[PDB]
Amino acid sequence: RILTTRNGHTTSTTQSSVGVTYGYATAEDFVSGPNTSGLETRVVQAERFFKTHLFDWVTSDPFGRCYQLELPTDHKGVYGSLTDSYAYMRNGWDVEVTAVGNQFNGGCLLVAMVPELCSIDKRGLYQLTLFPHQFINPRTNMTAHITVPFVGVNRYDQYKVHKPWTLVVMVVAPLTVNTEGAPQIKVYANIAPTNVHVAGEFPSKE
Amino acid sequence: QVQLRESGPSLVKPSQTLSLTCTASGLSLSDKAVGWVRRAPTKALEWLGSIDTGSSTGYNPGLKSRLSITKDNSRNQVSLTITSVTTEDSATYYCATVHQHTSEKRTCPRAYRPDCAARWDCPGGADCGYCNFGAGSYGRCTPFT
Amino acid sequence: SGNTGSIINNYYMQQYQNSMDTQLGNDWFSKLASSAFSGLFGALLA
Amino acid sequence: GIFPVACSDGYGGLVTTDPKTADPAYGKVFNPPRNMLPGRFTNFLDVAEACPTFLHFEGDVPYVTTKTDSDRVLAQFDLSLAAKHMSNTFLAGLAQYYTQYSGTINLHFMFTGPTDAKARYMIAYAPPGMEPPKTPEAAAHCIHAEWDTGLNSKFTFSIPYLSAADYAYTASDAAETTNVQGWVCLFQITHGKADGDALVVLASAGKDFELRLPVDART
Amino acid sequence: VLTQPSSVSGSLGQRVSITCSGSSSNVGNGYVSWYQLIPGSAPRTLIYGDTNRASGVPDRFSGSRAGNTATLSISSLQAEDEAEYFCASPEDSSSNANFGSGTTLTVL
Amino acid sequence: TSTGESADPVTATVENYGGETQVQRRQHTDVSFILDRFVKVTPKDQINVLDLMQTPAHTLVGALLRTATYYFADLEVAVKHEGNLTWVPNGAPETALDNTTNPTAYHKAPLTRLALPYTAPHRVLATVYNGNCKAARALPTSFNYGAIKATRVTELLYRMKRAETYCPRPLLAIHPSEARHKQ
């Protein structure tokens, strides 16, 4: 049950996997309406994965603590340029979390791709699983491959003020090491835009 | 016509406790405060601190190490102290009288108005509400100065 | 549809009654449940 | 025998928009044939498209001079229908009542200078988010159109409409934090021996500019 | 900081003007006064409040305020006008009233 | 059974073990229908902005609407005012009210009802917002259906018609100190 995804020119194979999940939709919705006069231009050189570092899951991390990351995460190379060139960009995300495990450690770490959170009061945390999610048990799959299409209050948005998707990681079960398991695995996200679109061009910096 | 008078040592040696005094025997400095300034020689204008009748001082921080001042109301004479003087400091004693007091508050930033809040149940220190409920500028009732 | 089902419809027209709607060119949380896996994942004796 | 009915509470009130029609005082009254009127206009937008209007630039004139210096910006005004540089035009005088507009806004430039002299003007559009440009080749990346002025003079750039929401707001505070609808420009890269010649601009409603939500506010 | 001239001229019976350039930090939030600072003598009130004056003072020299810069006029120049004319503002940057060095008001 | 851990819905439905499934006819749980109840909302005297999420969270609507990020509610207000209230569409200036050229309603007892077309210029409105630093915060001043000016508004009400909500978010219940919560 290995699963070898691929976007652009950046293949990311897995040896353990559970299967792709989906969120809120399978195929992204229409792209051009009255919002932009076809001034939309697709982009096909900006869909390559980019790593990122969330946190350091450790045996003293009690239930509840969640380190949330908000996309697009101000990319430095491709998709960092689409960012300062065009005022409006719309994308759907492909995000895979890879917590390395020794296979003798069970934490039941959970990821979600919740849209537009602010202040879960520790009461909604128990129900957080409502959004798309795959939670990884190192008894099983070391990764989780969510995918979400761009949901928002407009056709297109400005990613300088209104960041729609925030990755959420929650430790349901504190890590449990025994000499056989990693004393503390780190978690990292291959967050990868897909089906990008842009419209309208800023002037140069000078 | 309020009366004002100044007096001080005219033949002086630098780098000492220089202590000028001044007089104001009228209302222009009875409710309002004492003045101490001088002009820079062959240069641009000068500044030296002042105090209200409630012993509330305020000075320029650049030379705060050398400025301190006190005040009186009965003899209608006010003190001054300029220590650690260097040769560059020399002028005439003038403008013993201070004609102003301050005020800083400002409100209604952008298109917002403070009185029109609690229309959106505004939450927090900011008390300035958004006046015309149209396009978003700062969102809803972001705090002023 | 909602909490308003009347045999005689509405005296005013649709445009004045509700907002009008537009289109271009289905729901997901009533298909996720309908596509739920059921039954047993292993051979069942007895 | 009496038909039964229940009168709803608050169901009927005199709303100043009148979907219902009135009771007639005079049953029969005949007015003279009003047909074949000289010229009729169905909707204001057709009238707005049919006749272009002027815009009001600095110094209270419709013409923008031909600056002769190292500065190449002529008029750089916000795109909101209530900016100072449109306060005069018929399109603004209309959109002031409505609240939300969409679609293009045809700006008509026509060069009125003698055939002695000709000069190239380069309009440029710049979407919100970054402060408006300051010089040609800075706003070049932003969509823009250049044009000489020879045989015939009237050129009609069509400021596009691309905004976050599907409709923009006709009236918004323009004092600070710019406005979000967008900026425009009339950058003049070159001009040869033609200070006397002066540009005149004209605004109009584009191929589609159908406003909504009437609200007769103060005016 | 305030800036005030230090070189002015004029003849008898004709008007010369003094200008007091200031900034938003100091000019706005308070009055603009002028005094008769004869070099080596004491100053006395001649204009304070920009609109009003006290009892026993002459109105020969009119002061004003507009915008962010203060301006006075010296009507019917005389020999008693041979003195410094200081000015001030509330410099709210340090909650104090910044004063100005006065100009050498000569008489010809 | 299960073991997918792919977060893809799995439900036995009491079939596992020789039990038939008496039919489940879910009604009173359509968002087109459970979201159509007049919810009293604290009026703010003369000028209270009329918009969704003004209502307290506890009321039925005020909580079963925060369950959904984006709703498309075609709102219809019902007011109980003392002078002729003057509605106004979205984007109207603050001095826009009292013109009467706008949709107003003179006084007819006991109270006056209205329909309010969905004016706010978006695809769909959003309950929560991000990148802005709560109903009184973290959301654009534009998600509203106008302003309902009056001499005095006593008991304002919001009713939602044909609202299909999108993309659910978590609800919450009153946490009881002891189990088998007695009410």
Numbering used by the authors:
A (entry chain 2): 13 to 218
B (entry chain H): 1 to 145
C (entry chain 4): 15 to 39, 65 to 85
D (entry chain 3): 1 to 219
E (entry chain L): 5 to 112
F (entry chain 1): 2 to 134, 154 to 203
The publication says:
By contrast, R50 scFv binds to a depression between the 2- and 5-fold axes of FMDV-OTi and FMDV-AWH. R50 binds FMDV-OTi VP1 and VP3 by its heavy chain. The antibody-interacting residues on the FMDV-OTi capsid are located in the VP1 BC-loop (residues OTi-VP1V50 and OTi-VP1D52), VP1 EF-loop (residues OTi-VP1P94 and OTi-VP1E95), VP1 GH-loop (residues OTi-VP1R157, OTi-VP1L159 and OTi-VP1P160) and VP3 GH-loop (residues OTi-VP3D173 and OTi-VP3T177). The interacting residues in R50 are located in HCDR3, including residues R50-VHR119, R50-VHW120, R50-VHY130, R50-VHN132, R50-VHY138, R50-VHG139, R50-VHR140, R50-VHC141 and R50-VHT142. The side chain of R50-VHR140 extends into a deep cavity and forms interactions with OTi-VP1D52 in the VP1 BC-loop and OTi-VP1L159 in the VP1 GH-loop. In addition, the small protruding structure formed by OTi-VP1P94 and OTi-VP1E95 of the VP1 EF-loop makes contact with R50-VHR119, R50-VHC131 and R50-VHN132. One salt bridge between OTi-VP1E95 and R50-VHR119 was inferred because the centroids of the oppositely charged functional groups of the residues were within a 4 Å cutoff and because the Glu carbonyl oxygen atom was within 4 Å from the nitrogen atom of the Arg side chain. Moreover, the side chains of OTi-VP3D173 and OTi-VP3T177 form hydrogen bonds with the side chains of R50-VHY130 and R50-VHY138, respectively. Particularly, the mutation OTi-VP1E95A completely escaped antibody-mediated neutralization (VN titer > 250 μg/ml). Notably, the R50 footprint on the FMDV capsid does not overlap with identified receptor binding sites, indicating that R50 may not directly compete with the binding of receptor.
Foot-and-mouth disease virus (FMDV), a small nonenveloped single-stranded positive-sense RNA virus (genus Aphthovirus within the family Picornaviridae), is the causative agent of foot-and-mouth disease (FMD). As the major antigen, the virus capsid of FMDV comprises 60 copies each of four virus-encoded proteins, VP1, VP2, VP3 and VP4; VP1 to VP3 form most of the capsid shell, with VP4 lining the interior surface. In the current study, we isolated a NAb (R50) that neutralizes FMDV serotypes O and A. We determined the cryo-EM structures of FMDV serotype O (O/Tibet/99) in complex with B77 and F145 scFv, as well as R50 scFv in complex with FMDV serotype O (O/Tibet/99) and with serotype A (A/WH/CHA/09). The final resolution of the cryo-EM reconstruction was estimated by the FSC 0.143 cutoff to be 3.90 Å for the FMDV-OTi-B77 complex, 3.68 Å for the FMDV-OTi-F145 complex, 3.94 Å for the FMDV-OTi-R50 complex and 3.49 Å for the FMDV-AWH-R50 complex.
